[PDB]
Structures are given as structure tokens and as C-alpha cells.
Design a protein around this ligand. Structure first.
Ligand SMILES: [Mg+2]
Ligand SMILES: [Mg+2]
Ligand SMILES: [Mg+2]
Ligand SMILES: [Mg+2]
Lengths: 497, 497, 497, 497
């Protein structure tokens, strides 16, 4: 619950321009893949500008271009082999919509009474509109506030009956049809995953190499394990990333985080379920709790979201990305319409530059001590050795922490302590090398199995030099055997003769 | 240059709603007064929602409604006497504009050559456009970048001649006429204050009770003292607030701040003179340097800036205001078009709620020690006593620090250490009670002169109880004699019998 | 239980000699008054060398020279009026002695059996010796160790019977008669105060102006309140200083300290009741617990204790005094035979110089923060204001903290936070001005009653200048009204015109 | 110059007795070998009680029993092979003595004039005494103080002539003949090493396996390198330990420490060259400077020094040893006559118990951070890895830090950071395994050369279990390759199957 991040901003960093390669940044970028952001040329353009994880939802599109979207990613990877992309699938989850209307548009007047019925075939008007949530009367109570069309109107519940509720319109607006609805401070009793979603996961998501499931509208730890149950050993290697989008998720965040492999701060329902002035508290709290537990967090950030002119970001967009990095997020995220419809590459480019600037101003010594003093006394041998690699790297100004890991556990322990240098994770597991992209500062390279540790080390050293991640005269940290008995930390200096 | 702010966010603060009165917040709100935000009813509505300082520029309007704007403020004050409003005048300062065009619109093509001439009567086209800055050739050099129409196009200087320069258009766009221009990393050689501005200040601003002069485009300490020179003893009591809007101001910020009474982070030129990814560094650095020197800072924050739908703020708008408060700003500011054209009261209302939430999450003990460890060893008797009032107030959880001051110096020393409670400043100087609103947490009340200190204290105590600033059983800190020999700090408990 | 003290030792302090007046030291000296250390000339000599409290026990001497000792002190005071001496009476308390012997000397052999009988008239030998403690069989158990003649022999209890116990001699030595005895880890069931002691207190100690009662062999909080009970309102103003001399006192130290006005670390029984290697832990722990509670502590320190040559102290004697000051003792003490028989003035002189050196090396800023972080969150208005005086004095380098107090409570709160400067306590109570000498750094001056606070302040200022405690250009802290409502802290600068 | 040591004393440690083996202590004991402390039975008795380094001076004795003293040590080692003893030779160095007297005793009277002549054959009286220092007139000046017979008399220099000086006796005492002399604040111009000492070193000290040379009366860095020069490659592996015994050594301590392998605080001349009240400052400063540089320090501590009764230590003796350990000394030392003449084994036994108690109360986490924050930013790879072993050992509560080193450099880097557990140093160099005993907490075991690192590790593990230094279920730290490229830190858990 207690938070801190130490920045050290100099006049020199403000004036001297940055020419560091965008992909060397520690913060990773989740980019939602839209219609235009799919030309194999453009995904490569998006890779060069700093995308690390591809995000998609099967809410729209075909089954034809859903997998036409896959192979275009899978071939975009082959045109840039030094970049291993994560694949995240966003579930639809529970969702509440209004019904259809006689005029297909009504002008609800402030102070008027509005009936909400559960018969979804009822064609409504300004006096009575259908709601897709059949259990709406059994969930809300008199005094509860119902939001319609992204909170365009708020309705206070006056009466609850078996098949309908009666509300008072609190503000006058004009509504379309099939608009979204929100029930602040009310638990939605809908199945966490659909039967469409379940087979989209079990038979199409997992065979195509999907690594993350962003579970929409997670409200309890049960929802997480219910999902993990039905994925089975067929999907035992996929990371479940609950999306906290309402009060229920925030109330139970600790136990949801316990069952989770990460957290995603989605741009969407949370803006309507919580007052806007309290959202920034939730974002900062969730990032802190994820940082302390070593769990990765993805934070939605606005960037060229609305442009009625040319693509130059607003000041609030810049500080939103910068402060999310300073708050301690592993990934910043470009959402669907935030690619601007037309400028996805320019948006991720600016985001990468902001991440580099925010990363360069961090006092990593102070950040490390802050983490150490916030984590409990009984840490394991594995965590202590991972701790020692980070502190040794900072003291000697090492260029890399090379972590040998097969399940990714070693690299996650190191990333928990936020080193200033890149964590070069070496794995023989294809599932591991595309699951660790969600952690800040971790760059993975697949290696063969049944190889001596020392051979894998200097082979990583050679390709680190090839990728300009380390030069001659540098020191790098090598850490392996974390599983033991074999927990080990080495310093080796880059030479060649 | 080193920065830190300690937040303590709890789940309870996220869930429990805030019903604290908006005007009890510590962060103050500078609200730019526009056309519609002038109904005496609406300024009172703006006062209730949390305005503390009124901002205006004489760029537009008449001389008739400029003072029709004054008395409407001066009578809005009389309808809410517990709120003493500051009055800030924004100067126009140096300003660079393009010329007029034959078509009054040109489509400059990327890669084409564009001549910029100093003959402002020249009616231009896509090959040659006039620039109002007559000394443009003598200021920019080959390689300098010239921005037109809020950075809609960027032109690299290829040739400089006596009366014109030749540039290469770097991106294709369509321009209007009389559009603004920016010269990044180039000092603009224009008079800091006009002769229109000078007489707007000396003969209309100072007789109407203007307290702050926001000097646009301050580039050096000379600009500040040149302004202070020409205001004379007629305006010796007005605070000069330089606006840092380009690289030159940032380069010389320390010496500009030395000659200043405060700083204003304006929404405008700084977005074009500095790369967007580096603006957040400048904002945070300037706030830190102002905090360490005890100088107030006003930060522009976006809130309901663009609405093509109903007035609900974006997430980036919320975090922008919240993080500006957490960064340590004395005032957040609503700019002209950010009142939304139509929703100024709702914007300041949300801002006040955000300030209250951000203020309530601050760890004031940690913040106090952070300030103390960053300020130099040789502090004066006056600062030490002001320091003692803040620490005593936190330890005993006092409700108020009552500061008796005539020049405002005592209250500024206390505000420098950011107490968790309100600073109730008592002054006999009308100039002082409307100059201290720019400091965070300071609320002023005018008192009569030639009054015993003890009588002024309990009289402030009584009206503090009347304004719900303190109740029976509370402790308050009384601090006076700061000028001596007379530097004094008292604790008194609120009783009545 | 946690301890810390920050020293800052420079090469300059090691080389440059100290010429500061000995009586300006902050650590005070308790000096036991012996036979030769009683010439009115020598007590004045002892005053000049740094005595602050006179210690005596009525174990020996007459009733004639017991009060002949008083008036010689009371007239030694009149020859040096700037020094108000405290008067401490040491009670005898429980005490255990062996019996008389046929040869009046026995050679107990290691491994032999030794009977200890309760019949004190029995004239003993190497097989059976009487013990004055009649309840010895009911207190010790088989396995308990009995010490004789300052631990010259140790006897393990083998048998306990009604009127005797049987022990095995563990080491061979030769014993006199009427030698002391100790029962480690066994509670002694003897009355805490005698009927001789009780009337020595109620009818001779309190009428002669005795301020402190050093209660020998305190084992429980009951012993303290049993003493305080029988002193009554006739002695309600005398400070009870328990002497912790065995395991029982250490076990119950917290509750003994709660009922106490201070603690005395006596040189004596504690060396035999606890293993020597564990005594330094007890001394440091008790000093820390007294420091945290604001209770004064007196620590016995060796200095010219054994001299078979001329009076130059050993290195262990020097570090013992120096580390006791660094551990945080309010007073260091010269015991009876430690005056060397012949050199009391030289011993207190060296002690004063050691205290000055140890005091000058303390980092008072670090010490203050260490105290503040160890004391609980809910401190009172009085303690917070006393806290503010100490911190203000350090920040502005004030020469004095002038505390106006009648019960001494104000000065004790200030002394709890160990300021680097002298605490000048002003009281109208004769009992208060001679009770506060036990606190470190507090120098008292008696003032008249019914005087305005401001008049008392500058009158103390004038005599502070007369005593070279403050000069022109100095700042001093004035603190009064601590009782309210009236809690107040002032800074005044020393001028005269 | 800044000092700190964090103690955590509990009531439980005061009451619960210690049964830990004495040789498992971290502080090591230098014991001066005297006449009686030489029975092969008694040196073994001294080993069991905690001796780690044997100290001797060739000032007395024969050449026959000087080496009869060696082989008795060398065979005492063979009766306890788990204890490798260091051998320290104390040089005589510069030394100043009075002459012979007609009565062989004079009563110098305070105020009388005393001539000191350089003709050492002159048989003197109370008017004129010879001094062995021939250059005495050229070293002291009028106003200098000359000390005779352990400071029994002090003489202020009144006149300096070619072959004599005239002094005024400042105190009356009776002197023997050939008594020592001291010249406070005056550099003694005598050869640092004699020709007797030089051949005692080059032809008898180094062939017998002497490891440390305690150079008496070191006054400059030149003295250290002049000694190291004349030892040559024949003694390149011997550690030179300057003895700082006068003002000159303290003035130049930093540069003396730079050329040194350690420091010894000798009991002797320093008590006369510096005022007693300033000696504790010098001891604490020198220990701090040695701690920060990683250089070992030996501190003389009093223990059963004077006993006119049975051997129970005084309180000042106990705190002297305990505070020396808390100050941060690597070794405490029993000097010649401090073995009591009769009780050397009992004195070292009590010292070991005191060291164990003082060591057990140290807060090692706080001590480690204190060291880290006092050492400069640019530390090497070797020091960083040694740092990581200590912090990892504390976090996981490892039982041992096993250091593989041949020159001892690895173990010294680890000992610099004062781990709570034993440092088990493994070396193939006989010179290294008997030089590292001077560092706190380092226990050496000789191993064969040309052995794989992993084989040496678990072999040390097995004999660690045999010596009760580690049990099953423990974690130990293994650190090797510190020379590279090969700097390495491992954690291994103790199992056996
Ligand atoms: Mg959703
Ligand atoms: Mg401007
Ligand atoms: Mg006693
Ligand atoms: Mg010597």
C-alpha cells in the first residue's frame, strides 16, 4: 500500500537528444492489433518502433483473418529474428448492453422514470428499455446507480421487481441502441468465460502459440482458477492476466493477484465503475502490489488517442506514459482506437522515447533499496542470489545480467528487483522465451537443450556483442542453477583473443 | 535536480467516497477567465467548486469588458466573503506569426523549398511566406528547425540572408495565414514587454488590484528585472511569475527563478520548443527546484479539454492533475479552451476532487524529512521556527497553523515545508492577503492593524470555528514575531467557556 | 532493547587540548563523600573539578559527623553560589554476611562439604559457618551457587534443611569473618528498608534537604512503591533511585523503572550476581531503557581506583568513563574507595575532561533523530514543544535552552532529547532546582515566584552572560507555559543597548 | 572519522548462559607469551581458551629459550591441529632511558631545576641525570614536557644546549635509575629498527615461521617502507604491523596505514605521549579508519591486570574488552604482565566469553549497510563479489562463507564487511593460512595445490561438519576465482546421501 519511486532529473537530459535504439528500452509495449495495423510491412514497422507483445480480441473479424492475423505476425517475426513477440488474447467476458429502440434513439429527460426490463426482445422507448443482463433485478438494489452508453446517463434504482427495475434518470441525454451498461459497486453474475471464448481458447488460441489470456472483468480469485481449471494441461503454460475493471476486482485484488500470472489495467469499464478522481489511486496501488509480489503489470496509456489535427501528443498523454513507467509498470499499452486509426507506428515510437527518458531518470540504487526494505525477511536462496546479481550489476556497472532459466522463474526473480541493465534470459523452452516479454527489462533468446552452462554463457556473450548489448571491456553477470545446491552468480569480463 | 514524493494509498480511500468541502483543499486552482465563464452567477459557481486565482490575458476583448470583467469578479467576491481571490494578468510578450497568403491557404509539400521573408506585407504562397519576426535571419542558422501552425510543419533552415531565409519543408501539410511560429533552441530577440503591455500594467493592471504578472516567454534573469524595473514602486507589491516556454528559459531556469516570485508552466509554446518526450522532465525538474527554494509554481493541467461527447474526463487527464499535485505543484491551472467552452464549473470541480484525493494519500512525515534533508545546513531563525511549527503540527495532529504576517514572508516559510493542515495567514496588508493564494495550503484572512497579537490569535480561532476549520478539543499552532528577537511558536487548544 | 550512539572523532580534537571550564560539561558527576573528601576546602576543590551530586551512606560514621558532613556541604555551597549541589542518600537495604569463626580464619578446601547454619551466634570453622540471612534455606535450592567474600569462594547447594543448608566448596580459598554473601539468581526475602533506614530517612534525611534516595537491592516495583508509601507527603518531593544489583532487579527492570524517578548502576553486588561477561550487556540495556523513557541514570565508573603508584588512570578506566557517556548516561559516579583514599579531586578532574571529550565527539543531529525514531507515535503537546526547542537550538546553533519550570517536568522533557547546548532551568521551587542535577545538561537557577515570564527570561539572560553561558550575538531558546494552552517556544538573540 | 556500531541487547541474552565453544568466536586473541605461559600444557590450555596469535619480544630471554619457545609452540600446534597459530614478533625500536644515579635513587622536588645530559656514563643526582637519547637537545624546545619513569615526573624544558637541556621539575617524586622517558609531541630521531633487530628478523624471525612484525614506535610511512625495504624478498610474505605509540604516529596515521598490513594499539607509550582523556578518541578513530580500509587492527585490552586478590575481572576491564569488540577491532590482546603473572588461561577465557557476548549483540544487517554507505562508489569486481557473499549469507542465514584464496586477498575482502558467520578460508600457501588469523572471523585450513575448485569445496564442507561448523540442512556460501573473469559466488546446501 506504501509507494515510492526515486527520480533524478538533470538539465543535461532535458537538452541532449536521445539516439538510443528504441528496442533497448526496459519498459515493454503491448500494442492492440487493429484493421490497418496488420500490413506485414507495418507490424515490422511497429517492431522497429518498440512493440513487444501483440494484443487482439476475437470480438470482431472473421475466423479467416483471425488466423490471417496470426501468420502475418508469425512471418513478421521471421523478418526480424532478434525480436520474439508475445501473443495476448483478450477475452470478452461478462458484458451488459441495452436493447433495441422503436426510434432507435430516445431523449431520456432528467427526472423522468425509466423501466429496465429483462425481456431483451422488447423494443423500447424513453419510458422502458431492455437490458441484456437477465439477472439485473437480483443484483442492483434501490439506490444503486446504473450507467448507460459509457456513462452518458446515470439512473438511480427506485424499484426492483422479478423481471424489471424502475429507475430515475439523473441527467438528460440521447441514447442509441445496444449501448454498454455498468453497475458500479455491484457484482455482475455472469460466467467469466463463454462457451465461444472457451473453444476460442482451447482449440484456436493455444494451438497458434498464444501466451497470455487477458481475462476481462475478473471479480474474484475463483474466476481465475475456474479459468485455469478449464484450460487444463493443454494450456498449463499460458499466463492468465486478470483485467480489473470494477469495484469487485479492486476489493479482492490481493487474492486475485495470488492466483494470477499478472495484471492488466484496461482502458474501459474501470472508468465507469469507479469515480474518475479515484482511478489514479487504484492504478498506482495495483502497480505497487504487483511490484512487491514480482508479478508483471500492463497499464493502458493514452497516446495520440484523439487527433482532429496532425499526430503530436498532448502533454497529458506524455505524462500519463511517463508516470506509468515511473509508477513501476512492466508494460505500457496502446489500445485499439489509440493507434489513432491512422498512426499506430508514430504512437508506439513516441511511447518508446518516453519510456527511455523515464527509465534514464530513475535512481536505481535508491529503487533497489526501496524494494528490499519493502519485501519480507524470509527470502529464499533463489531470490537472494537473484538479488545479488542485481546489486552486483549496479555496483560494477555491468552491461547485462545473463540468466539461464527454463521455466522463466530465474528471470522473474531478477526482474522483481528492477536492474538498470537488460536481463538476457536464455531458455530452451519456446513457451518461456515468449512468456517473459511481459516482465520489464527481460529480453529472451532461445537456446538448445542439453548444453553445458559455460558454453551457453559465452554463446550468449557473442550474440550480445552482435546485437550491441555488450562491448569489449564490459562486465556481465551470469546467473544459473536457480532451481539446489546449484544457485550460482558469476561475473565475467568481455574479451576476445 | 533530485526528486521524491511519498504516497500511501489504501484500499479504503479508493472505496470510501469523499464528502470534504472542495475549498478546504491545499492545492489551489488558477482558472483562466473566458467569455462564458464570466456570469457573476458562474464565477460564484466557480468559487464554490474551488477557484482561488483568476487568470486573464488582454490579448482579446475590449477595454470595456476587461474592467467589466474586473467588477464582476470584485462583486462575485462580495457574495462569498470567505474567499479572497487572486488576480493574475498574463502578458503577451514575444510572439511570432506567419504572413498573409494569396489563396489564404497553401499546401506545402514535403521536400519543397520555402522562403521566409521579413517583409510582413508580402502576400505569400507555397514558395515564400512572410514572418512577423523581423530578426528571424539573424537568429536561426542552417540546420535550425522552424515550426509553423502549432508545429503542423517543420522547416530546416538551408540559407540565411539579410531579409529572408530559405528552408526545406520536412512534412507536407496545409497552412492558414497568420499562424504561430516557434524556433526551437533559438533565443528570440524581441522585447519582453510591449508598450501596450507596459501601459496595460502601469495604468490599468495595478490600479484594479492585480497581484500577479505572468510574464510570457521569459528567457533570462534580465527579462525579469527589466520587467521589475519598469513597474517601479507603483507596482513593488506585484508578484512577477515568469513563464518558461522555450529552451532558453530552461537553460537559465535557476537564475530566472532567483529573480522571480514564482513560476508558471504554461500550456503552449513549450510543447513545440521541446520534444514531447522531454517535457515531463522539465515540468518535474522545475517543480522540484521551486519546492526547494520555497517559490510557488503553477502547472497547467488538462481537464475536459476535448469533448465531442458529455463532460467525463479521460484517464490521462485525471493522472495529469493527480501527478502534478504529487510532483509538488502549488497550483494546478485550467487554461482558456480547457473550460471546454461550455463546462468550466464541472472541470474545476473534478480538479478539486482529484487534488483532495492526491493530498490525502501523501505521507507528510516522509515528505517533511525529504525536504529537510534537501535544504542546506545554514537556515535562519525565521525558517527554523517556521520549520518547528510544521513538525509540531504533524506530531500533535494540529488542525491549523495560524501565521501572523504582514509581508507574507512568515506564511511562505511555512508553506515551503508543506504541512498536512491548513496555514491560516493573518495580515493587515491587502496586498499580502491576495498574494499568498499562490502558495499551497495558505488561506488568508485580513485583520486590522495596531492589534495585540493575542487578540488577533483567538479572533482567528473564533472565525476558524465559524468556517469549520477547527473544532473544540483541537490543537492549533500560532506563529508570529517572524521579522528579532520575537520569533515565536505557540500551541493553544480550542476551548470555550 | 535496540541501541545506537553516533560519534564523530576528528584528528583535530585528538591533538588540540581542551581548555573549556570543567563545570560546563553536560554529564554530571556523583561523588561519594568519604572521610578525607570532607575538608570544606576539598569539597570546594571537588566542586571546581566537576562534582554535581554528593553521595553518602549512613552505614558508618556517627550521627555527629553525618550532619557535620551536611553543613560542611551546605557551607561549601555558599562559597560557590553558581553551583547547586544535589544530595543523595544511599540506603543499606538487604545484606547477607557470614558469621564469626573460631580461628577467625578458615582455609576452605575445594571439594569439601560446608554447612551454612542460620544460628548467627554459632562460631564456625571450615566445616560449618553461620549466615546472617535467616531464610537462606527457604530461598536457595540444590544446584544454586552461594558466593562468599566478594565471590572469593563459590559453594553449590547440595542439601536444604529447616535451619541450615549443605554445600560443596568449588574452589579453595581462605576466608575472614563477617564477609559478604551473594545468592545469584535467587530473590532475597529481606525488608527493602530497615527501621533504622526508615527513621534515618523520615526524621534526618528529609529535614536536611536530601533529594535522592538510592534504594539498595531493589528487586520489584513493589519495593519501590513500598518505599514511596512510607515516605508519605513528608517526602513526596524526594526522588527514589532504585539500585539494580542482582538478577531479580534485571528481570523486573521495566516495571521497576516505571515506578522509579531514576536508576543507579552501583559498583558492588551486580558483579557477583551476574557473570562478569554479561554485566556490560545489562549496563548498556538499562541506560538505553532509561534514555527512551526520559528517566535519568547514574553509572558507576572506575577512575584511579587502585594506585600502588602515582595517580595516572589506566586505559580501561578512561574508556569505561568515556563509553558510559557515549552509552548515554546522565551521571558518571565516583564511588567510595575510588577517590583513591588520597586523590578524589584528581579523579573527578580527569572524569570531567573525559566527559567533555566524549560529549564533543557526539553527532547530536544523528542522536536526536535516533531518539525520535525510537519513541512512540502519540507524544503530547508538552513533549512536542520540548522536542521543538532541541531541534531549533541545533539548527540555529543556539547557546542555551532556557526552560521555565516549577516541578521540573519541562526540563526533563528537554533533557530526554539530549541537546548539544546547556539546558538552563529556572524554578521557584527549591526542591526542583536540586532535583534536576541528575539529568544530563540541566543547570538550575532559583528564581522568585509571582514574576512575569518575560522578566524571568532576560534576567536569566543577564546572569547567563555573567556566567559565560552566552555572549552577545548568540541565539537562545526560551520555553515555558508547559503545564495548556500555554505551551510556548521562543527564540531571542542576545543584545544589549 | 565518522563512527557507528549497532547493538541489539535483549534481556534473554543477559540471563541465558553461553555454552558456545570459545574458539568459534569471531574476534581473535593476541596473547603475549611470558615466562610461565610457556608450558606446552599451558599453551594448549591457552589454545582451548581462545588464543589465535602468539606474541613475543626478544627484549629479554636467551637465544636458547627464544627458539625453545618456538618449538614448544610448534609442538603445541601438533596437539591441536584444528588451530593454526599466528606468530607475531614485537620489535624494540626507538627507546629512551634515564642514566644511573649516585644513590641509585633521587627525590626530585617540585620547582627544582634538573639538567639532562647526553653523556650516558655520567652518574647523576637530583640536579643532573643522563639521558640515553643523544639527540634530546636537538629534538625538544623550551616549553616541551619530558616524562620520566612512566610519567612519574614531568619536566618542562627551560634551556636547550649542545650536550644537555635544563628543565624545571613540575611534580615531586622519587626516581630509580634507567627509567623510561617520553617526549610528548616531539618526533624521536632514532633508527626505526636496530642492527640487533634487523638480524633478529632476517636470520631468526623469518626462518622460524614468523608472520607478523609489530614495529614499535612507527612515526611515518617512511619507517614502514624502510622496514619493508630491508626485509626484502626473503620476507616479502611477512605482515608489517606498525605500533602507533606517540603523537607523530597519530598525525601521520593515514599514510602509515597506507603502507601497512595492519595496526596494533599497544599498551605502553601512547598513555604518556597523549593525555589520558584523549586516548579513547585515538583508539576509536584508528579502529574506524582500519575498518574502512579493510586493514586489521589489534587493540590492547586490560583483563586481570592487577590482582591483589583472586582472579575476578573488574567492571572496567570487562567493558574495555567488550567496547573494543563493539568499536570494531579484529583482535583483542593480552599483554605481558596482564596474564597476571599467574592466570593467563583464566584471562583469555574471560576475554573469549566477552567477545562472544559482544558479537552476539551486533545487528549485522545494520553494520553491513553502515560499512557500504561509508565506502566509496568505485569498488572492484572482486570487492563487489565479496560483498555479495556477505549479504547473501545474512539474508539466507548461511552457516559459513567458504573462501578459496591463495594470497588471502579474497578472505580479507570478505572480512572487511564483517559477516555474522565464520569465513572459512582455504589456501595452499602456508604463509597465507597463518597470516589471515589477524582478521576477524577468518578461520583458515590448508589444502593441497592443483585441485579442482569443486573438490576443494565439498572437502571443506566435510571437515566443516567434522568441526561442528556446519550441519545438515545448512546453506553455505562458496566464493572463488577472485583474482578475471572468474569471480564467482555459489550457494550450496549441506546434504549427504
Ligand atoms: Mg470487460
Ligand atoms: Mg508566449
Ligand atoms: Mg546492596
Ligand atoms: Mg615502543
Amino acid at each position: 500500500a506504501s509507494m515510492q519511486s526515486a527520480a533524478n532529473i538533470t538539465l543535461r537530459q532535458i537538452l541532449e537528444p536521445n539516439n538510443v535504439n528504441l528496442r533497448s528500452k526496459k519498459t515493454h509495449i503491448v500494442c492492440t492489433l487493429g484493421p490497418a495495423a496488420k500490413s506485414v510491412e507495418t507490424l515490422v514497422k511497429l517492431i522497429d518502433a518498440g512493440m513487444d507483445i501483440c494484443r487482439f480480441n476475437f470480438s470482431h473479424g472473421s475466423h479467416e483473418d483471425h488466423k490471417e492475423m496470426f501468420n502475418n505476425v508469425l512471418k513478421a517475426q521471421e523478418l526480424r529474428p532478434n525480436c520474439l513477440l508475445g501473443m495476448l488474447l483478450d477475452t470478452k467476458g461478462p458484458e451488459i448492453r441495452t436493447g433495441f429502440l422503436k426510434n432507435k434513439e430516445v431523449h431520456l429527460k432528467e427526472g423522468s422514470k425509466l423501466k429496465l426490463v429483462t425481456d431483451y426482445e422488447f423494443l423500447g422507448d424513453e419510458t422502458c428499455i431492455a437490458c441484456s443482463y437477465k439477472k439485473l433485478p437480483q443484483s442492483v438494489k434501490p439506490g444503486n446507480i446504473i450507467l448507460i452508453a459509457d456513462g452518458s446517463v446515470s439512473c438511480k434504482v427506485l424499484e426492483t421487481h422479478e423481471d424489471h427495475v424502475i429507475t430515475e434518470v439523473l441527467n438528460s441525454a440521447v441514447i442509441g441502441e445496444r449501448k454498454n451498461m455498468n453497475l458500479p459497486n455491484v457484482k455482475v453474475d455472469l460466467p467469466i468465460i463463454s462457451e465461444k471464448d472457451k473453444n476460442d481458447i482451447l482449440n484456436f488460441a493455444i494451438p497458434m502459440g498464444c501466451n497470455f489470456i487477458a481475462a476481462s472483468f475478473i471479480q474474484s480469485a475463483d474466476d481465475v482458477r475456474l479459468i485455469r481449471n478449464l484450460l487444463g494441461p493443454r494450456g498449463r503454460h499460458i499466463k492468465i492476466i486478470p483485467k480489473i475493471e470494477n469495484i469487485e476486482g479492486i476489493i479482492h485484488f490481493d487474492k486475485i493477484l495470488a492466483e494470477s500470472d499478472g495484471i492488466m489495467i484496461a482502458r474501459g469499464d474501470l472508468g465507469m465503475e469507479i469515480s474518475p478522481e479515484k482511478v489514479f489511486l487504484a492504478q498506482k496501488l495495483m502497480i505497487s502490489k504487483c511490484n512487491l509480489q514480482g508479478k508483471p503489470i500492463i497499464t493502458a496509456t493514452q497516446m495520440l488517442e484523439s487527433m482532429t489535427k496532425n499526430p503530436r501528443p498532448t502533454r497529458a498523454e506524455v505524462t500519463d506514459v511517463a508516470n506509468a513507467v515511473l509508477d513501476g509498470t512492466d508494460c505500457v499499452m496502446l489500445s485499439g482506437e489509440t493507434a489513432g486509426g491512422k498512426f499506430p507506428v508514430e504512437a508506439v515510437t513516441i511511447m518508446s522515447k518516453i519510456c527511455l527518458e523515464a527509465e534514464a531518470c530513475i535512481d536505481y540504487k535508491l529503487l533497489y533499496q526501496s524494494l528490499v526494505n519493502a519485501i519480507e525477511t524470509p527470502i529464499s536462496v533463489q531470490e537472494a542470489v537473484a538479488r545479488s546479481a542485481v546489486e552486483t550489476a549496479e555496483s560494477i556497472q555491468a552491461s547485462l545480467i545473463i540468466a539461464l532459466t527454463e521455466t522463466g522463474y530465474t528471470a522473474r526473480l531478477i526482474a522483481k528487483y528492477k536492474p538498470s541493465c537488460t536481463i538476457l534470459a536464455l531458455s530452451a523452452s519456446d513457451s518461456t522465451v515468449k512468456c517473459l516479454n511481459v516482465h520489464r527489462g527481460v529480453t529472451c533468446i532461445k537456446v538448445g537443450s542439453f548444453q553445458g552452462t559455460d558454453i551457453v554463457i559465452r554463446n550468449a556473450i557473442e550474440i550480445a556483442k552482435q546485437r550491441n548489448m555488450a562491448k569489449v571491456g564490459d562486465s556481465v553477470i551470469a546467473i544459473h542453477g536457480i532451481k539446489g545446491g546449484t544457485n550460482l552468480m558469476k561475473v565475467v569480463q568481455i574479451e576476445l583473443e
